[PDB]
Structure formats: structure tokens, C-alpha cells
Subunit: 208 residues, 5 copies
């Protein structure tokens, strides 16, 4: 029977923003899917590209669930009130530029959806952008401090159109986008960190 | 008899900045109206524009109302102490740069007016900007996380001149500006999100 | 009987930074006078200017008064501890860049002086900058959300040289500066808002 | 029997971010190791480079130690909640830009690991970058305010690869990176401050 | 018998960051000495220079004093926990870019030292930079809101090398550095404000 103000007030009491909601000591499964909106400044010479995309991030936080029999089953909450995967583009050369309100969608069962529009610059393979096969820029996104046992990242497998969200007014066109999964590991640290490798195949429009 | 201090103190007591002020299941009615102030940069090749506009935003938050029969019926309040629509430009390629003091005007009847001066960059149709008929850049603005059942957005038609606020020193000129209501929906999300579609018809100024 | 630490204490106990210190229900008299220090990146084709100035701002706030018969009559105080006029340049195209500590000077009688050095870009008339008559760039500054009945702004007329503070190293030189008070109103809003119009007549320094 | 929520609570409640965690009267032993990921901009004329590197930083704080007999032995914690070494690149000409979530890992034994990905500009020898022997840009990093008696700096002792983390799409390549321990001192200050002189020997990729 | 935590806690208990540490109506004596590290982005046409210096700043607050006979006689403390002179470069045209941790050194006798490394752009005389006699760029730094009877500044003119800290990889070199005390006053304000005028004599490097 509680209103929306109550659902939020109760989230502040149960939600520990700095505590990863690990349950039955099993990694938190984070789903990550980049919705490409536009490809801006491209420099084949320096192998750098500016990209705008909506990062659809979904996961479950047990400590957030509530009874929605006699009340709203969803509310928007500031990400500062909840725990959020500490994801990062392993090959980014600029910090992520969040262009939208930093609010996440929370379902009464604990399901969380955070989908910010992000603009960011990447260090990838730009060669071939001005060709028919185009270039394929690969973006590695995974947790920065939570190894495979605390966080698992998997791409949301859905055959949705690759350029469904892509701006028609962009100078470039998307040929294909494949989001695979991997597990990076270095000599700095023993364990392995999961990541989703998003390969963006694009090229310039209006070519001869 | 009460001063402005009482009105503010009262707002700090009832205002819930992180909770949408909806009554029943009826969504919050947000009115959006853009007053174009300047068109700074335009790129015919990349289809990008840098513009300055005043985003006239109004809505109702009855949980803020107060008795003004013997006190001011309006006060300027910092937006941080109020709930504000999580509006965003769906095709912006830069974060909104707010140029003015972040204060809203609150009327004793619960009405809220927030009109910031914003400089922002968009990806839109720039073709024809050098012709007499000009270019037509469409800017879509709507709630980012609140679907139609939660937030409604509509323009504000009138007999106002599209150049009433426009700078005469700009390199461009406005031909016509029409703001229509529209709705967006992606395969990411089931429900639909209302948005105001602002069509800016402008061209570069001639030796005239 | 009191020291600078006690003054600050009492100030923090009576000052209401988010409440305009209305006196007798009359509008707060705000005085503003720009002291030009430099003219930097000028562009006659885009009618854009980048200038640096000290914005001399004064007003009265009775709620800050204190007896200084045998105590300091003046103290520097962070602006966050005081109410400040929500002033904005109506034709600015970049946010004000405050180059100095944000401290204000408060006198025991309630007089407040805030004079920050600001770097900011404006949209204004730059035509003729490289001619002998020079260009005349007009900058409009006034309250953003407080109308005439709440705040009043007038140029702090004081016998002084137009380039008393102007850098001798600028590529440009000031020919004249006239600061006149005015008023603005739009079909958006019923009441009027006061502003000060600063006309900066300048030109690129010749050679021979 | 305590979970991560309990551990995080304890750490946050025990950590003293402003107090150097000096065990006994010995200095705090900090280990620093730069893992270069890219060399973005290089200017031989101005001897200035723009580089992206992960700064492996480790130290100990016994106050955070907890019993992990039947509890996690590592947790992610925001650095704002921990004391962190006040490291500064002595030859940096721009503030370090942290591109990743500012979280550190704290082991149950009080061991702390913080490894952010940082983009920063340095003033260093770039002459010879376009030769087979390449250029050797040396970067000095150490405590800014804690001398040898309070903080000691040593390069992560380990025979590792220099290009392991390096981007294959960079316009440059790494020939060698020798990170040697060192010390600095000036007439300003009588004591000595330890640092880690990192020698970056790199050159531009051949057109082949 | 007091650890560094106790020294900080005492400081946190008596320090008044927003209150100048005045002693018997005498002005606080602040010492300022710039150590040049690099000279970059120089423009003889616009008379603007980018400079990087270690602004050595010292003053005294004897209320923070403690007995260090058998306790550390120095501690590093965040400036946010201390009162710091509101110093400003009068002819700077960009805000100060602080490149180092913002920590100060408090000594057991009440002395405080703050020496951040700063990168800032200035408006000054750059003419003659490419000549043997080089150019002389003057930089003024003094209190922004505290007049002569509240704050006094003087250069720590000692017997040191002007290029002791100066980078050998800079395109320029220092011929001489004279740091003299000085004062300023404008029609705006009745009292005078002290400042140290640093005359930097530098020229480009040209093996000829
Ligand atoms: N393997 C490995 N290392 C990885 S994968 C993603 C980030 N890292 C390095 C790292 C690991 C832990 C911390 Cl606190 N900071 C940086
Ligand atoms: N349809 C759809 N999706 C839309 S319309 C406007 C924004 N979005 C995406 C979205 C939806 C929900 C959240 Cl919490 N964040 C982003
Ligand atoms: N007329 C009019 N409108 C003016 S004059 C100066 C600023 N404005 C717009 C405005 C009016 C009210 C608020 Cl809360 N915000 C912006
Ligand atoms: N010698 C010397 N000085 C050094 S080595 C590393 C930094 N410094 C300068 C310094 C020393 C102390 C403080 Cl509080 N701030 C800056
Ligand atoms: N003379 C004079 N005025 C000076 S010297 C250095 C700064 N100023 C102006 C000033 C004076 C007082 C305040 Cl609160 N803010 C700025």
C-alpha cells in the first residue's frame, strides 16, 4: 500500500551502494549491451574514434526487492542510492561522458536496469574505415575491480537490429556489431576478470 | 503572515527531490518549450550543430503548495531542493551545458517553472542550411527513465515569434520552429516514452 | 568583545543563503559594475568575444549586521555562506569561469561586496573591431529568476577610467565603456526583469 | 561469519583517510609500477607527450585487517574511504586524469591495491622518437608531501614485459621501460623524497 | 606521547579554515616564492604564456602548535582542514590548475607550508622572447579579499638558482627571476592589497 516515496525510503535502508549484492556467495551476473547511437570524430591516423552509445546494463540486487501487490512495481532511483557494477572500457582514452540523468530502473523483485547515454573516445583499429569492408573497432568493457568470482559479464543475446538506435545523420554506417565474451588476465593480479568484447564494424558512407 | 524563509523552510520539509510527484496513477504533466537564443556552430558534412536555447519547463508538484493569502505567492528555489523531470535530448552528442543559476520558480499553487539557458550539441539534419529554404534540425527531448504512464510531455503552442529571443548577431537566422508531441519506443523496453519533437528550420544569413 | 571567529559564527547562524534578504518588502538593490581586464579571443565572423573582467557586485543584507564598536567591522566570507544575487549574462555563450577565491567582503552594517574575476565568452557585435571606430560589444547582466519587484540592478557609477584595470598587453584597447541600466520582458513571463547593459567599445591596436 | 557488508562497514569505520598508516615508527612502504597502455600525442618540438598508463600501487594498513577464517579475504572499496599515498608525477604538465572507477582492493591482511588507468601529459625528452633508437621519456613519480621517513617508494619488483599492456594500435611502440627507484631533494626543503624514475624508451612505428 | 592521528585531531579541533589566524590585530604574514618548472604554450602575438610553477607558500597559526619533543614535529594535512591565504594571480587569464595533492605541512611550532605545483596562463609581456635579451613576463600574486592590514605577503628572496627546478626540456630558458614585494589599489577599493611581483626573464633556445 506504500507509495513511491516509501519504496525509495526503504531502498535507502536496505541498499548498500558500496556493497556488491553477492548472494549465496555466487558472482553477480551483469548483462551489458551497447546500443550505438553515433560515430563522430574518427582519426584513422591515430586509431582513435569518438562514440556515443547507450549502455544497457542489467543485474539483480536481492536487497532491493519489495512487495508490489498493492503498490507500484517500478521506480527510478539515483544510482548513488544503489550499488552499481564498476564497469569500464579497458581501451578507453577518455573518461565516459554521461549525457543523461543518472537514474536506474528498479523492479520490486530486485531487477535493476541502468542505461546511460555515453560519449567516449576509444583506442582501436580504425584502419579500413574508408573502404568497402570497413573498419572493425573493438571495445572491451568489464569490471575494473571485481574478478570472475564476484562479477560475471555476459552480452545480452538478442538479434535486435545493429543500427536500430544508430543516427541516420551520422557520416558513418554500421555494417555489423558482434558482442562476444572474454576473460582478461595479467601478471599484476592472479585471478581473471570477465569482459564483453564489442566489435564495431563500420565505414564511411557515400564512397565511390 | 509568513516570509520567504518560511516558504523555503516549508519546501525543505515536504519536497521529495528523488520521488516523482504523481497523483494516483495519473502521470506528471511536464510542459517543454524551447526558446532558441543562438545557433553557434553548424557542420554541413558531419550534420552537427551547437545551439543555445532556454528550456522552458513547467509542471505541478502539489506537495509544495502553501497559503499565500498574506505572504509571497512565489519564490526562487535551488533545483537541488525540488524534484525535477529527468528530461534529456535523445539526439544530443554532448552533455547539456547549463549557463544560468540553477533555480526554479515555485508558485504557491504548486506550479513549478525551471527555465535554464542551455548550450548543447546535437546530431540532426543540416542539409540545405545554405539554401533559401534552409535546413531542418529536429531535436527530441523527453523523460529518460519514466515511461508515459509516469511522465507526459507536451509543447506550448502560441503566437510567439521563433526569433523573439534569437540573437541578431548569430551567423544564422530562424525561419520557423514547430514543437510537436511524439513517442519513442525501442526493443530494450516494453512501455513507450513521451517526447517533444522540436523542429528548427534555419538557414545561414545572406548578404541581404 | 567579539572576534573574527565569533563574527563568522553569528553570520552562519543568521544568514539564509537560499532566501533573498528582502527589506520592508522592497526589492533588494543590487549594484553591478564590470572592470574589464582583458579582451582575448575575438571573432568578427562569428560575433563572439572572450573577455576577462572583475564583476564588482554590492548589496545589503541586514541579517548579517553586528555591532563592531570594539570589534572588526569587516570580514571575508565564502559566498556559500551567504545569499548571492542569481546574476547571469543574457548573451553569454559559455558558463562564467571564476578565476578567483569565491569569498565576499561583509561589513558590520550588512553591506556585502563580491568582486570575482571572470573569464567568459559572449555573443555580441564584433563588427568593426579592426577599424578606427572599433567594435561595440554589449553585455547584458541581471537576475535570472528574480523580477523587478524582488531584485533591482543598477550600474555602480563611479569616477574611473575605462581601462584603469585593463591589461596593457592585450592585442586590443578600450575606447569607451558605458554601463546603462535597462529592463527585459518576454511572452514567457508576465513581469519584467532588470538588467545592466555594458557597452564595450574596443578595437584592435593599430601599428605604424 | 561476517559478510562483505560487515567488512565494508568495519573498514569505513576504522579507516583514517587523512592519517598516514605508519606501522610503528617505520615509513609506509609504497610500491609503484606503471603499465603503459598507450602513447597518444607526442611533440618532439615541445618535448611533451600524452600517455595512458595503469598505475599499480600497493601498500599496507593494518587497521583494516580483519579475520577471514570464514569470510571474504578481499573487498572493493572507494579510495575516498581510505588513506591513499599522495603520489604526484614530478614532471607532469597536466593533472592526472583517472579514467576508471576509483576503487581499491583491500585484502584481509591489511594489504591495499589501487591501480587506476591514468591519462596525463608530461614534460620529457622526446628527441629521437622518429629514429631506430627511439626517444627516452623519463617520468618521476613519488610522494608530494611525505619524505623518506614517512613514505618509501619502490618499483614493483618483478621481471615482466614492457609492452604486455601496451596498445597494438598506438602510433608508437615500446622498446624498453626501466623503472628504477630514486630520490629527490631541494634547497627549499632539507629532507629527501623518494620516487620511481620510469624510463620510457619508445619510437614511432615504421611505415612498413 | 602522541601519534600523527592525535596531531591531526588537535588541528581539526582548533583550526578555523574560514577564519584568518590574526594575532592581536596584526596582519597574518604570508611568504610567497614561485619556483618555475616549465614555460609552455608561448604566444608573442597575443602576449600570453602558459607557466608551471611550485608556489611555495608559508604562514603561521600558533594555535595549531604542539610539543614534539617525543612526537612528530610535522604532519601532512588536507588544506580543506586548514585556513589558507586567498591568494590570486592578478594577471592570470585561466583558473589555476593544481597538479599535485592538495596537502599542506603543519609544523609543531605552528608553521604551515603549502607548495602546490600549478599550471596557469598569464597575460604579460612576451615581446623579445626570441631575442638574446629574451622577454620579461610579470606575474602578480596576492590576497584577493584581505587588505594590507589583514594579510601581508613578501617574497622569500634567498640565494637560489632560478632554474634549479626548471625543466631542461622546455623550449625556453630562464635568464633571471626577480621576486619583489609590491602593492595595488583601485578606485573600487579604499585600502591596499599586498602582492609579490615576480619578473620572469626568459627566452627561447636557439643554438646560434
Ligand atoms: N588481469 C588483470 N587486471 C585487470 S583486468 C581489469 C583491471 N585490471 C587491473 C586492476 C586490478 C585490480 C585493481 Cl584494484 N585495479 C586494477
Ligand atoms: N524505448 C526506450 N528506451 C528509452 S526511451 C528514452 C530512454 N530509453 C532508454 C532507457 C530506459 C530506462 C532507463 Cl532506466 N534508462 C534508459
Ligand atoms: N521575460 C523573461 N524572462 C527572463 S528575463 C531573464 C531570465 N528570464 C527567463 C526565466 C524566468 C524565470 C525563471 Cl525561474 N528562469 C528563467
Ligand atoms: N625537495 C623538495 N621538495 C619537494 S619533493 C616533492 C614535492 N616537493 C615540494 C613540496 C614539499 C612540501 C609540501 Cl607541503 N609541498 C611541496
Ligand atoms: N585595489 C583593489 N582591489 C583589489 S586588489 C586584488 C583584488 N581586488 C578587488 C577585490 C576587492 C575585494 C573583494 Cl571581496 N574582491 C575583489
Amino acid at each position: 500500500a506504500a507509495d513511491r516515496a516509501d519504496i525509495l525510503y526503504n531502498i535507502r535502508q536496505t541498499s548498500r551502494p558500496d556493497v556488491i549484492p553477492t548472494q549465496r556467495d555466487r558472482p553477480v551476473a551483469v548483462s551489458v549491451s551497447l546500443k550505438f547511437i553515433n560515430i563522430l570524430e574518427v582519426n584513422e591516423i591515430t586509431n582513435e574514434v569518438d562514440v556515443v552509445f547507450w549502455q544497457q546494463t542489467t543485474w539483480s540486487d536481492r536487497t532491493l526487492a519489495w512487495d508490489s501487490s498493492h503498490s507500484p512495481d517500478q521506480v527510478s532511483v539515483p544510482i548513488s542510492s544503489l550499488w552499481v557494477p564498476d564497469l569500464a572500457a579497458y581501451n578507453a582514452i577518455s573518461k565516459p561522458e554521461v549525457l543523461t540523468p543518472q537514474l536506474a530502473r528498479v523492479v520490486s523483485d530486485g531487477e535493476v536496469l541502468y542505461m546511460p547515454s555515453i560519449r567516449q573516445r576509444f583506442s582501436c583499429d580504425v584502419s579500413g574505415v574508408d573502404t568497402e569492408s570497413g573498419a572493425t573497432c573493438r571495445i572491451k568493457i568489464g569490471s575494473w575491480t571485481h574478478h570472475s568470482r564476484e562479477i560475471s559479464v555476459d552480452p545480452t543475446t538478442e538479434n535486435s537490429d545493429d543500427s536500430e538506435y544508430f543516427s541516420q545523420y551520422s557520416r558513418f554506417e554500421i555494417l555489423d556489431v558482434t558482442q562476444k565474451k572474454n576473460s582478461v588476465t595479467y601478471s599484476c593480479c592472479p585471478e581473471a576478470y570477465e569482459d564483453v568484447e564489442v566489435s564495431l564494424n563500420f565505414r564511411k558512407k557515400g564512397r565511390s
